Design a protein around this motif. Structure first.
Motif, mmCIF file in Angstrom:
data_model
loop_
_atom_site.group_PDB
_atom_site.id
_atom_site.type_symbol
_atom_site.label_atom_id
_atom_site.label_comp_id
_atom_site.label_asym_id
_atom_site.label_seq_id
_atom_site.Cartn_x
_atom_site.Cartn_y
_atom_site.Cartn_z
ATOM 1 N N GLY A 149 0.666 -1.261 0.098
ATOM 2 C CA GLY A 149 0.127 -0.032 -0.084
ATOM 3 C C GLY A 149 0.795 1.264 -0.007
ATOM 4 N N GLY A 150 0.031 2.624 0.119
ATOM 5 C CA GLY A 150 1.023 3.867 0.182
ATOM 6 C C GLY A 150 1.701 3.831 1.165
ATOM 7 N N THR A 151 1.203 3.313 2.512
ATOM 8 C CA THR A 151 1.912 3.558 3.767
ATOM 9 C C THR A 151 3.518 2.732 3.443
ATOM 10 N N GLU A 152 3.284 1.428 3.171
ATOM 11 C CA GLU A 152 4.504 0.681 2.990
ATOM 12 C C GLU A 152 5.634 1.529 2.068
ATOM 13 N N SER A 153 5.043 1.987 0.908
ATOM 14 C CA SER A 153 5.634 2.745 -0.211
ATOM 15 C C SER A 153 6.314 3.949 0.503
ATOM 16 N N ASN A 154 5.553 4.611 1.093
ATOM 17 C CA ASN A 154 6.152 5.859 1.733
ATOM 18 C C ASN A 154 7.304 5.537 2.754
ATOM 19 N N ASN A 155 6.924 4.638 3.857
ATOM 20 C CA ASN A 155 7.721 4.281 4.820
ATOM 21 C C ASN A 155 9.159 3.694 3.960
ATOM 22 N N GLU A 199 2.041 16.983 4.654
ATOM 23 C CA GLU A 199 1.930 15.581 4.369
ATOM 24 C C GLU A 199 1.085 14.573 4.865
ATOM 25 N N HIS A 200 0.867 13.520 4.103
ATOM 26 C CA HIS A 200 -0.112 12.440 4.784
ATOM 27 C C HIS A 200 0.867 11.748 5.951
ATOM 28 N N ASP A 201 0.050 11.369 6.711
ATOM 29 C CA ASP A 201 0.479 10.595 7.991
ATOM 30 C C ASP A 201 1.473 9.689 7.764
ATOM 31 N N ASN A 204 -1.947 18.998 -2.574
ATOM 32 C CA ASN A 204 -2.162 19.180 -1.039
ATOM 33 C C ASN A 204 -3.736 18.202 -1.064
ATOM 34 N N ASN A 205 -3.377 17.474 0.077
ATOM 35 C CA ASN A 205 -4.417 16.509 0.507
ATOM 36 C C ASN A 205 -5.764 17.180 0.907
ATOM 37 N N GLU A 206 -5.714 18.553 1.738
ATOM 38 C CA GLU A 206 -6.976 18.998 1.840
ATOM 39 C C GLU A 206 -7.585 19.943 0.913
ATOM 40 N N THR A 254 8.238 11.965 -4.278
ATOM 41 C CA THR A 254 6.952 12.751 -4.468
ATOM 42 C C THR A 254 5.806 11.676 -3.991
ATOM 43 N N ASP A 255 4.845 11.701 -3.204
ATOM 44 C CA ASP A 255 3.680 11.138 -2.799
ATOM 45 C C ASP A 255 2.715 11.554 -3.843
ATOM 46 N N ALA A 256 2.526 10.678 -4.696
ATOM 47 C CA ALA A 256 1.337 11.000 -5.724
ATOM 48 C C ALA A 256 0.221 10.342 -5.865
ATOM 49 N N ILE A 310 2.768 5.258 -5.427
ATOM 50 C CA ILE A 310 1.599 4.728 -6.145
ATOM 51 C C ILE A 310 0.572 4.086 -5.187
ATOM 52 N N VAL A 311 -0.800 4.534 -5.177
ATOM 53 C CA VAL A 311 -1.651 3.975 -4.150
ATOM 54 C C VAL A 311 -2.949 3.429 -5.010
ATOM 55 N N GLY A 312 -3.045 2.361 -5.047
ATOM 56 C CA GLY A 312 -4.295 1.664 -5.519
ATOM 57 C C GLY A 312 -5.664 2.156 -5.524
ATOM 58 N N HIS A 313 -6.087 2.302 -4.231
ATOM 59 C CA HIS A 313 -7.284 2.620 -3.705
ATOM 60 C C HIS A 313 -7.650 3.994 -3.991
ATOM 61 N N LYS A 314 -6.712 5.028 -4.484
ATOM 62 C CA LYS A 314 -7.121 6.197 -4.816
ATOM 63 C C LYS A 314 -7.511 6.209 -6.115
ATOM 64 N N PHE A 315 -7.190 5.212 -6.994
ATOM 65 C CA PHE A 315 -7.527 5.140 -8.479
ATOM 66 C C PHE A 315 -8.626 4.061 -8.785
ATOM 67 N N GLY A 343 -2.913 5.095 11.957
ATOM 68 C CA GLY A 343 -3.418 4.448 13.095
ATOM 69 C C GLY A 343 -4.199 3.115 13.045
ATOM 70 N N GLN A 344 -4.497 2.634 11.792
ATOM 71 C CA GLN A 344 -4.829 1.283 11.628
ATOM 72 C C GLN A 344 -4.360 0.273 12.305
ATOM 73 N N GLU A 345 -5.002 -0.803 12.760
ATOM 74 C CA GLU A 345 -4.355 -2.214 13.560
ATOM 75 C C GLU A 345 -3.789 -1.398 14.785
ATOM 76 N N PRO A 363 -0.263 0.473 10.446
ATOM 77 C CA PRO A 363 -0.912 1.248 9.866
ATOM 78 C C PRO A 363 -1.072 0.960 8.329
ATOM 79 N N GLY A 364 -2.053 1.809 7.636
ATOM 80 C CA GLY A 364 -2.193 1.753 6.376
ATOM 81 C C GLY A 364 -3.833 0.957 6.285
ATOM 82 N N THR A 365 -4.597 1.734 5.209
ATOM 83 C CA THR A 365 -5.968 1.307 4.856
ATOM 84 C C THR A 365 -5.988 -0.048 4.744
HETATM 85 C C1 LIG Z 1 -4.152 7.744 0.682
HETATM 86 C C2 LIG Z 1 -2.808 8.339 0.657
HETATM 87 C C3 LIG Z 1 -1.692 7.763 1.092
HETATM 88 C C4 LIG Z 1 -1.688 6.040 1.493
HETATM 89 O O1 LIG Z 1 -2.533 5.723 2.510
HETATM 90 P P1 LIG Z 1 -2.927 4.106 2.822
HETATM 91 O O2 LIG Z 1 -3.762 4.051 3.984
HETATM 92 O O3 LIG Z 1 -1.708 3.415 2.977
HETATM 93 O O4 LIG Z 1 -3.616 4.038 1.511
HETATM 94 C C5 LIG Z 1 -0.543 8.450 1.204
HETATM 95 N N1 LIG Z 1 -0.340 9.603 0.582
HETATM 96 C C6 LIG Z 1 -1.442 10.300 0.285
HETATM 97 C C7 LIG Z 1 -1.241 11.839 -0.048
HETATM 98 C C8 LIG Z 1 -2.660 9.786 0.209
HETATM 99 O O5 LIG Z 1 -3.896 10.101 -0.199
#
Ligand SMILES: *Cc1c(COP(=O)(O)O)cnc(C)c1O
Ligand SMILES: *Cc1c(COP(=O)(O)O)cnc(C)c1O
Lengths: 388, 400
Positions: free
Chosen positions: A70-76, A107-109, A160-162, A195-197, A218-223, B246-248, B253-255
């Motif tokens: 997922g995106g979190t793993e990619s970012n980390n 940035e995203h968490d 920008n996420n917001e 870049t977190d795209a 790259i984050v699957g559930h956003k597309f 915050g997941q798990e 974490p992660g969706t």
């Molecule tokens: C959705 C998103 C992510 C990834 O979060 P997951 O819960 O891992 O999908 C990362 N960065 C941005 C800017 C996002 O919108």
């Protein structure tokens, strides 16, 4: 009686074609990816095809794509690899001198938290650069000025996420490229750019040559894809180093071990195809709906409402409208709590942030749906703030 | 028709599992914590699946953490252990780990990495050159003042031999009271149970372990996994490898991948419901396989998974047929029907070295060089057994 979904930047439903690819892969390509039997060979070909699909989507090459959970793993992974890279470069010249990172405050968490962690642990230093209290766009000059001899990576979200506002990744890449030539003269190592795209794909053309970045998330559930992701790394292992977070069986060229999740990869691949084929059609529809929506919100709310994503000259995602309505009773979560149809999320300048709501439209959103939520928003506002 | 006998490498998905996944993809696509229908359905699927997994292993729902797979789960326990040692110090020298010589790559490699980098010390206990089981006394004698984790797979995946997890836990429990008297940290126990789920009863109270790795695709479930942590946050710590949303409970974490989790949960319900049935069937078929191999090859075949008094998974038969032209990969190359493997699949790349695992259990290089691993499944029939034994008979002839 129906709900109107306008929270596509948080997640998206799966395209029907994506669902089918996943189901078929589960059924027919269940074998271990290395093997020569049919189910194995089908898994191999699926993974190989999906790798090419993601590369095309972003104008990169198949070998530059690493599949992740997922995106979190990619970012980390990018953040982790950078720390490791720095340690490997200090042990090769030869808590003390520590890797330095540059990012932005919004940035995203999954970018902010790993970085906050490194600071707390005293493993690294980080400059969080502010977005422009006006455009809410980072300013390239603040990024260049934050660079130090130990700076290793600049990670800046594409949008920008917001608010949906596009950050200036190209310029950042170009001006860092120039600075790296001087740094290199002084025996300083290259500052890489990630870049977190996550929010851009499927909504706005993403081309890695144009962005000039070294890593892209790259984050699957956003597309409209399944919940896995990937990481682009420019000529990984040649042009750009990548140290893994996981150790095991060799998959993803030992950059990301573990048995490949073929069905998820088949879905992400199909999702990517659809972007490659229709990005322009998606973006157009999104833009028509978001603009019509902003027309209806000003018509209805007039002077009371402030559009927080719209600035003359400032590029933004086509589907995003972050707005705030003036009034002590119109805090964002309160407005949404009172809506009966609209599904969206809180969108958070100080007094305006408290009442911010982020609307994000999608591929299927209609003007008829827009009309329903403006009407919904009208009653919610009447309930809370009352007529003015 | 190919006959598949490589279930220890991966398994197909049960039809009910495929359906749980497809339904979830369609209806439970939203954010688990949002209150709209697609989100609420996802939250229910996730909670239900967490309960399913806890029931499968005899534990509690809160003891379960979802992960992207066995690899992630194994790396997580090793990372968290290093961190925990560090935190315990700071609040007050490198942590020490005990494992065995035949662990999967995802336990051996992260531990090797820790040694190479001088972050930790690790004793790789050799297994019995006799039967291939690591012995309780060698694990216990390996304990050092800084030992903070003992990680040993429940069942070896190449030969099927079961490791004495229960006794190891019992003995470490005893040892920990003595360590407590001196103030030494307590030693925790983890088991990579990947190969055991769905083939033999797995119960954490019987096992006495503090951590346990769960792998979806070894039990007809999807390619994700989980990790059991006893009384996580209360009796056992888990430090994350990932940071984000915050997941798990922030342990991971992660969706949440809801469809994958629905699949994982259904696969666990089937184990809870039918484990004894799968086990009995596997054993009937495997023992039949061993009888036909012996009747067809006589003294020419060595049954590498079979010792007297050595417990073993019920579906596994590692064997070698003596003959200079019978290297495992050569026999398999000639089979026309049977799909099996020479050892574990992440080692598919070097099918021509004898198995390091077989070597470490005491198998000659001459015998290990010729080793083939047959692992049967829920659907395997005696007829299929008969087909592959003839296929092996013709393979060995074309060769020798
Ligand atoms: C959705 C998103 C992510 C990834 O979060 P997951 O819960 O891992 O999908 C990362 N960065 C941005 C800017 C996002 O919108
Ligand atoms: C299958 C297996 C794993 C997990 O491997 P993945 O590649 O991540 O699915 C871990 N340990 C053992 C003993 C296994 O058999």
């Amino acid at each position: 009686n129906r709900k109107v979904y306008m929270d596509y930047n948080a997640t998206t439903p799966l395209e029907p074609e994506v669902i089918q690819a996943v189901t078929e892969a589960m059924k027919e390509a269940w074998g271990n990816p290395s093997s020569s039997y049919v189910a194995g060979r089908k898994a191999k070909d699926i993974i190989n095809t999906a790798r090419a699909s993601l590369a095309k989507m972003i104008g990169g090459k198949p070998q530059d794509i690493i599949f992740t959970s997922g995106g979190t793993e990619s970012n980390n992974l990018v953040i982790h690899s950078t720390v490791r890279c720095f340690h490997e470069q200090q042990t090769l010249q030869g808590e003390g001198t520590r890797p330095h990172f540059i990012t932005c405050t919004v940035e995203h968490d999954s970018i902010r938290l790993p970085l906050e962690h490194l600071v707390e642990d005293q493993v690294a230093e980080v400059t969080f650069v502010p977005v422009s209290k006006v455009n809410g766009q980072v300013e390239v000059e603040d990024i260049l000025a934050a660079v130090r001899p130990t700076t290793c990576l600049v990670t800046i979200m594409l949008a920008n996420n917001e608010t949906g506002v596009i950050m200036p990744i190209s310029e950042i890449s170009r001006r860092i490229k120039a600075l790296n030539q001087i740094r290199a003269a002084s025996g300083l190592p290259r500052v890489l750019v990630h870049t977190d795209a996550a929010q851009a794909l499927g909504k706005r053309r993403v081309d890695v040559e144009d962005l000039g970045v070294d890593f892209l998330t790259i984050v699957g559930h956003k597309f409209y894809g399944p919940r896995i992701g990937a990481l682009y790394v420019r000529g990984v292992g040649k042009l750009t180093p990548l140290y893994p977070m996981l150790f095991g069986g060799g998959q993803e060229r030992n950059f990301r071990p573990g048995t490949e999740n073929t069905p998820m990869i088949a879905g992400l691949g199909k999702a990517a195809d659809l972007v490659s084929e229709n990005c322009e059609t998606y973006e157009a529809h999104m833009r028509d709906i978001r603009d019509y929506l902003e027309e209806r919100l000003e018509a209805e709310f007039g002077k009371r409402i402030h559009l927080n994503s719209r600035f003359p000259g400032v590029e933004r995602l086509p589907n995003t409208c972050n707005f705030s309505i003036q009034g002590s009773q119109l805090r964002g979560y309160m407005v949404l709590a009172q809506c009966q149809t609209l599904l969206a999320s809180v969108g958070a300048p100080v007094d305006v942030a408290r009442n911010a709501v982020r609307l994000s439209v999608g591929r299927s959103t209609t003007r008829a749906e827009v009309d329903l939520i403006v009407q919904d928003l009208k009653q919610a506002v009447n309930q809370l703030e009352g007529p003015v």
